Amino acid sequence: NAMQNKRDSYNREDLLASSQGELFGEGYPQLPAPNMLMMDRITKMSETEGEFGKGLILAELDITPDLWFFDCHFPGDPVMPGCLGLDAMWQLVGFFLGWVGGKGKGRALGVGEVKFTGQILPTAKKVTYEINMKRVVNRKLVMGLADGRVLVDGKEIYVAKDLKVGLFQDTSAF
Template sequence: MTYQEFLERTHFDKEELLAFSQGNLVENPPHELAKVPAPPFLMMDRVTEIQKSGKKGRIVAEKDVQIDEWFFQCHFREDPVMPGCLGVDAIWQLLGFYCCVNGAPGSGRALGAGEIEFSGQIRPHNKLLRYELEVRRFTMLPDQGACLAIGNGTLSVDGELIYRVNDAKVGLFTDIGYKGYPNRTENFMGGLLNR
């Protein structure tokens, strides 16, 4: 799809999210475009709603729970449960994707979260995860080659609200991407992000 079509979309299916994770969804973007993680770490199967209203917005996504998810195989033996950190990461993934569909350039990075509360769990025989994210602030910082988004997210499993993530923060930054892995190209070392 064209970049303009990408910016105007209000939903994305699994095939489109997979293409986006590989950098193959948008034809000739005008700048560096962040990616969502590729499977198995991609924590959504579809984006069902995107609303934009200036510096605020909303984005909703879903994931179908599979009985053989990679995390059920190791977390924990004889007590399979989805790690809570993956639900938090799903909120960050969704917030980063929101930045992309709002035209932000760069590579995405999770920057933190405020209060996180778990009141339930996800087991292999559950069916559907639903992530809802209210974006409280979306700001482009072109002089710094960055953008910042802050939002409050929830995760429901089969219709029951079980996670809350307040003040999730994601930034997109230009010129920090590490292309050419595993070769030692530019930006091959980690450490403090000076932005």
């Protein structure tokens, strides 16, 4: 039952293994599988770095023209849905909760304030995510709180304050 695969970076196959419940062991939170997975790699996981000294996650998504959301959102006007970049941030906070040893199913609990000041077009190369954990609670529930930002080819475009994700052993009555 000892946790496996704890390290400071993860590739796409690792992310898929998370989505299948295999990366860290059994019973850890899962990333989504395609087509809800919104990252290709996690380039940095740290428990003590970041703006608050309580956790830093750096991750990125390669932008290629086959990605399903461009054609439907919107026809003749392709743009990555902001909600999916927001979800990538929730996904990363949940991933951190499992990475530090938390067990259970992840559920996003909300966010304090989100501002979108730009967009992701099919012509972009890379979307990067930066998650600055504020703190993780284990008192009663298991919950992570963070601020996050999303950049497209180096330009900040989304900023989210107080991303909140919880881990739940039983979601039947959630």
